[PDB]
Amino acid sequence: QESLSSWIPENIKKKECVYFVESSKLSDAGKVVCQCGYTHEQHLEEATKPHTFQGTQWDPKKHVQEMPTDAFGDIVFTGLSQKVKKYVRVSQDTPSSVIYHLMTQHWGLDVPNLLISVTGGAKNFNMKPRLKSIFRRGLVKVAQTTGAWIITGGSHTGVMKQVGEAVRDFSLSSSYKEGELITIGVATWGTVHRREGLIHPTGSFPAEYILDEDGQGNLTCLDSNHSHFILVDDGTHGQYGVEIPLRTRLEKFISEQTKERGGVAIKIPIVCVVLEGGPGTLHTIDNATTNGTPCVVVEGSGRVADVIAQVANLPVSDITISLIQQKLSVFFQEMFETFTESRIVEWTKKIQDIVRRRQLLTVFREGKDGQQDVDVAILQALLKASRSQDHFGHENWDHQLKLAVAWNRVDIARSEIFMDEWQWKPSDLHPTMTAALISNKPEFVKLFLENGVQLKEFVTWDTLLYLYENLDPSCLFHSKLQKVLVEDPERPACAPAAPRLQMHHVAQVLRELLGDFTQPLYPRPRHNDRLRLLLPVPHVKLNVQGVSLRSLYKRSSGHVTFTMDPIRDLLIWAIVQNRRELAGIIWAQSQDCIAAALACSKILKELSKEEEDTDSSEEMLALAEEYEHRAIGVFTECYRKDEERAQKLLTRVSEAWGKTTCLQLALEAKDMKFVSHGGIQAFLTKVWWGQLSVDNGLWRVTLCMLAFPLLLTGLISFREKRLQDVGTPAARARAFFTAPVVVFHLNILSYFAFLCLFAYVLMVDFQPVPSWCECAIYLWLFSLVCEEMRQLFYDPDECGLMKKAALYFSDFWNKLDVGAILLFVAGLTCRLIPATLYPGRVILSLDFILFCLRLMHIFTISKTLGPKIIIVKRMMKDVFFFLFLLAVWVVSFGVAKQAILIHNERRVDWLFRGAVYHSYLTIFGQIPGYIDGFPEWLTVLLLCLYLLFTNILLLNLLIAMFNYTFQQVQEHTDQIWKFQRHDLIEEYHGRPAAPPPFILLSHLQLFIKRVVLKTPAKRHKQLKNKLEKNEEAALLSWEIYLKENYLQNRQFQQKQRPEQKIEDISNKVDAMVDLLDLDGDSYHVNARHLLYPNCPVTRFPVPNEKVPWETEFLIYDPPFYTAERKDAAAMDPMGDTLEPLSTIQYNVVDGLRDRRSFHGPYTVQAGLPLNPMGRTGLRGRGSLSCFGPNHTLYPMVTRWRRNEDGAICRKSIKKMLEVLVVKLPLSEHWALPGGSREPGEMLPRKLKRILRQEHWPSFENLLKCGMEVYKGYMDDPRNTDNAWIETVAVSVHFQDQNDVELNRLNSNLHACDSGASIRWQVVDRRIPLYANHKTLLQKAAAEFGAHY
Amino acid sequence: LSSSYKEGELITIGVATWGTVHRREGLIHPTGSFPAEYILDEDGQGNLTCLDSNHSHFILVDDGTHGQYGVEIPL
C-alpha cells in the first residue's frame, strides 16, 4: 500500500501561484487576493518576493509552477456512510497514461466495458417527475448490466445528485449483491468548501471529511456517493470549467488507447449524454464532439436540451443569430434579460459547430422511444455511430457482433444486427462463437445456432486447441491440467519442452478421469505425440515423438481435420468446466447420444468426488444425475420401438469414445438408476439363459439337468427348437450347456456335493492317514484355487500385477475365501499329525460353516432372495452388534440364576456347563424345573423381568428397526441387486461349461496352448460386440431420429407442467404495464471550423449572417495569426506584412509564384488579399505558402472493379469504381496523392516522387494528360482570410482490366521509398477519406456512372 | 429450426429462369449427378443472380437467352 504513497508524490504535480499580483477588483471579504488569493494575504503559498520582476498581470504560464502532490489518500464521510472512497489531486496538465496506470494498478480497477459520461445543470436544475423516473430506472439498468463506468462531475448539487441517489439506492436495494456500479467523479480542486482538512503532507490513508450545506459561498461541496474522486487544480480559486478539457482528454485515452486483443486495437464504446445545462454544458458538448465521442440529447427535458433538439434536423446554413436568441429567450425566461450580444453569438456558434457534425449527434426525441427503453436508445446510439464509420467490406456487421458479445444483452444483438440483410458466410461467427463459448455467456450459443452456425464443421483442431488453453482458472479441471504439464515437465519427461498445453495432455488427463479402458479420444503415438513441440524437432523424416503425416512444423501441427468426434469434443470441454446450461445445448447435436451421456455422467460423478469441499461437488453430482435421467429417457424411447435393435445398440462398441461399450461404461459410474430400467435387466436375463428361453420355469430345467435323456424329449423350450435347427442332438446339448444358467447350476451342485464329501470323511473316515476318499479333497482345493489365478490373468493391466490384487483385497468375500483356504491350511497340519486329532476334530468343524457363508454368497440370484439377502448385507455389522448385545443380556442373568440357589454339580470344564451352558438352554426350552425350582417368589419375579426386556423390548423392537429400515432403502436395495446382477453374469459367461471335476483339464488347456503360442491373443469372450460400417450407420441414424423424438416429449413436458405455466402468465402481464402508458446557403463551412491543425490557436466567431464581406460585422477582430513556419524558406515571408516588404504581384504571376486566382479577382485591403468566399475568422497567412490562392494539383486515378470471372461488378443502380489512395505514417487517414504546384510538371511528382517512380514516373507524367473535372477555390480548414487553397482536378481512367495502360502503372511502381502504405481501394460513400477529398470523389463520380 | 425437428416440413418450390444463374457452370453434368455441390457467392453478381438456400425444390426454365428477365412467369 505504501507503494502508492511513495509513487504519487514522484509523478503527479500541482499548481500554485508564486508571485503577488494584486487584483484591482477586491473579492467579497477576500480583498487580500493577488488575482487568485488561495490561502494568504496574496496569491502565494511561500514568500511573496519581488523575484527581481514585479510583473503586473502575471501570466499563468510564467507565474504558476508545479510542486509534487501530497494531497492523495482516502476519505470517509463522517456519519453519512461507512465505506471508503479514493481521491487524488491532479495537476491541470497531466498525461492520461499516468492517471490510467494509477487507477488500474494502484486502485485495483479493471478495464471497463462502457464509458457513459453524464453532465447537466448543477446549481439551477428543475425536473419533471417523468424526467426523474428515467434517471431512476434506465441509467441504473444500463450501469448494472454492462458494468459501465459512470463518470461525471463531483459536487453536491443537481443532476449528479440524482445520479448519486440512483446509484446508492440500487446498491442498498441489491441487498449486498456481488459487484457495485463504480462511479468516478471529476471536479476542479479550486472550488472545494473544506479542502483545508484534506491536505496532508504524509500519506493520509485515514481521513475524515464532513460536509456542510450552510457555508456554501462561491464554493460547493462534494458528493457522498461517488466511489472515486479526481481533483484537478489550476492555481485559480473561483474558476469554473477547469475540469472539462482534462475530462474530455482522459475519456478519449481511456476509450481508444487500451484494449488491443488479437489485432491492432479495440475501441471501447463511449457515450456522452445531457439532460439540462447552461454555459458549461455547451462547452463540454463542443469539446467532446471534436474527439469523436457521440452525444445523445433528450428532448422535452430542459432549456439547453430543448434548444439543441429544436435545431436537430435544421440545415446548418439556416441558423440565424436572431432565431437563436429568439429560441434562447423563451426557454431561458428566468434569466433571458441577462444575455448580452457576445454571449448570444458565442452560444450560437457553439450550437453551429455542434450541429455541423450530424454523425456524432442523436436525439431522444421526447419519445415513444421510452416505452421501448432508454437502455436501447443509449445503446444503439453507439451502434449507429458504428454503422456510420466502417471500412472496406462487411466489417460493420462483425464489429457490432464483437461489441454485442461484451454487452451481455441478447435482445440488442437480435433487434438490429440480425434483422437487416445479414451476409451469411458463416465463417464470420467462428471468432465470435469462440468468444461466446469462452465467456459463458451460454445464451448467445443458441442465438448463433438459429443463424446456421453448424457445429459439425465449426469445431476444428486448432479451434479446440485454443479453447482448451482458456479454461476457467478456478475450475478443478484446469488445476488438473496445470499439473500434468508439470508432472511431465519440459526437461525430464517431454524432453524438448512442454510449457504449452496440447491435446495429448488433455487426452492423458481424460484417461485418468476415465477408467482402465483403451486409448482416449486423441492420438498418443508418434504420429501425433503432442507433448514436445516448442524446440526445433525434425519434420516428416523424424516420425518419432514429433510430426509424421501433418503438413508443416510451424509451432503447431496442421489441420487434423475433425478427429471423427467434433460434437463430443465440445461436449467434454463444456462438461469439465461445469457449464450446465451450455452442455445441454451441445448434447442435443450429438451423434452417439447414449454413450456420450453415460460418459458425461461418469466424468461428472468422479470429478465431483475429487475436491472443492462444497456447493459444486453437490452441483456436479446433481448434473450427473440429470444426465443420467437424460440418457435413461433416450434409451427408453429407443427401447419402446423394436427392442431387438435396442439391445444390439446397448452392447455395441463406440469408436468415437475409446470404445467403452455402453453396458461396460455404465458400471464404473455405478449408475444406480440406468442399470435398473427395464430393457437393461431384460438384456441381462437375455445373456443369462443364453440360448434356451426366458419363459421356462426354474423347477423344470433342473429335472432335465440330471436326466440326460430328458433333454431330448419335448419338455424344455430352446431357441434352436422353434427354428427346428436340431440336426445334431449333441449340438443342441452343447447349446444347452454353454448357457450360463446351467454352468451355474452344475457349479452349485458340485459345491453342494463337495460339502457332503467333506462330511463323509469326518463321521466314518476319521483316520490319521490319507485314505481312498482323501486325495479328492486335495485335488478339489487345487482346482478351485486355480480359478482365482485364471481371473488374475483374465483382464489385468499389462504392467500392474500388485495393483490388480488390490481390488481382490477390496472384496471382503474374497478375503473370506482366502481365509477359508488359510483355515484349511491350519487344519490340515493338525489332520496329518497323529497326536492332534482331537484339536483337528474341533478346528475343522467351523470350516464347514465358513464355507457355508461362501455358499450363501453365491445365492445372490433369486428374485425374492437377492433383494432380500441384500437386506442382511445391511445387517452384517449389526449382526455382530446384536450378537454382542444379546450375549451380554443372556450372561447378565446367567450369572444371577445360579447365585441364590445352591448348585453343587461341578467338574473339570463341566462346572462351567452347569454354571453358564445351562443358562442359554433355559431360554429356548431346556429349563430344568426340578433343579431350577423358599426363594420361589423371587424366582418368579426375576424370570418375568428378563423376558419382559427380551421378548418384549428386544424381540418386537427389532421388528420396528427391521421393517422401517427395510422400507427406507428398499428402492436402493432393489436397484443395488439390479446393479450387482451383472457381476454374477460377468464371471460365469466367460467360462467353459466343464464340471469343476473337469475344469482340471481346462486349467491345463491354456497352458499347453502357451507351449505353442507365445502372446496372449487367444480369444475375447466378452460382450464387446463389434459392428460394421453398413450397420453402424443404419443404427446411429435410427437413434438420432429417436433422440429428437424424445426431445419432443421433455420439451412438451416442461410446458405442460403447471408450475411452468405460471411463468407464462407472469411475464405476459409484465407486457401489459408497458403497453398502456402511450397516452441552405452554401458557405466555406470547413474553413470556419475551429482547432486549426498544427497550430494551437483559435479563430474569431464569424456567423452565417456575417460570413460575406458585404455584410458588416462590427465585432470582427480576428487575431493576426501566423504559423511558426510563416518566416521561413522560399515561401512568401509576408506573414508579417505590416512592413512595406509586401510588394509581390497580386492577381498576377509573380515569377515562379503564380499568385493569381483561377476563379476571379480578389479584393486587396491594407495591402493584403481578402477571401472571396467570405470571412474565416483568422487573419494572417497561417501554414500556407503565400497570400491569396496557393495553387496545387490533385491528380486522381480511377478504374473499374471486376469479379472473379472478370466481368464488371454490379450495383442496384450505378456501377462499381476503384481508386488508388495513400496513407502516410503520421496522418492516420486516407488521402489522394496530390502535391503542391510549386514545380511546373513535377507537381504529381512532388506528391509521388517516392511513391510512383523515379524515371518511369516521368513517362507516367507524359501519360498523365487526362481530363479535368473541377477547378477553383477549395474549402479547407487551413484557410485564413488571406491565404486560401485553389486546385485543378485532373482525372485519368483505366477502362480495360487487362494488360494495357494499367500494365505500365504496375511495373513502374516504386512505392516503398518513404511512404507507409499504398493500395487500390473501392469507391464508396462511406469510404474513409478526407472530407475535402470526398467532395472531389463525389463530384467526379458522375463522369463515369459510379454509385453513391 | 424452432419446431425442434417436428414431423413434416413446409415444402417450398422455387421457379427461376435458367439463363440468369451465377455459377450454373458447375451444375451441368452429362451423367446423373445425384451428388453435387453448389457454392453461393454474393460478390460476383453482375446481371446474374444467386439462388436461395432455403427452397426445398427448384425448377430452372431455359429459353436460349442469357440476361432475359421474365422467361419464367408464363410457365
Ligand SMILES: Nc1ncnc2c1ncn2[C@@H]1O[C@H](COP(=O)(O)OP(=O)(O)OC[C@H]2O[C@@H](O)[C@H](O)[C@@H]2O)[C@@H](O)[C@H]1O
Ligand atoms: N463545479 C460546479 N459545481 C456546482 N455549481 C457549479 C459549478 N460550476 C458552475 N456552477 C454553477 O452552476 C450554475 C449554472 O448552472 P447551469 O447553467 O445549469 O450549468 P453550467 O454552468 O453550464 O455548468 C454545467 C456543469 O456540468 C458539469 O458536468 C460541468 O463540469 C459544468 O460545471 C451557476 O450558478 C454556476 O456558478
Ligand SMILES: Nc1ncnc2c1ncn2[C@@H]1O[C@H](COP(=O)(O)OP(=O)(O)OC[C@H]2O[C@@H](O)[C@H](O)[C@@H]2O)[C@@H](O)[C@H]1O
Ligand atoms: N482537407 C483536409 N482534411 C483533413 N486534414 C487536412 C486537410 N488539408 C490539410 N489537412 C491536414 O492539415 C495538416 C497540415 O497539412 P500538411 O501536413 O502540410 O499536409 P500534406 O502535405 O498533405 O501532408 C504532410 C504530412 O506530413 C506528415 O509528417 C504529416 O503527418 C502530414 O500528414 C495535416 O494534418 C493534414 O493532414
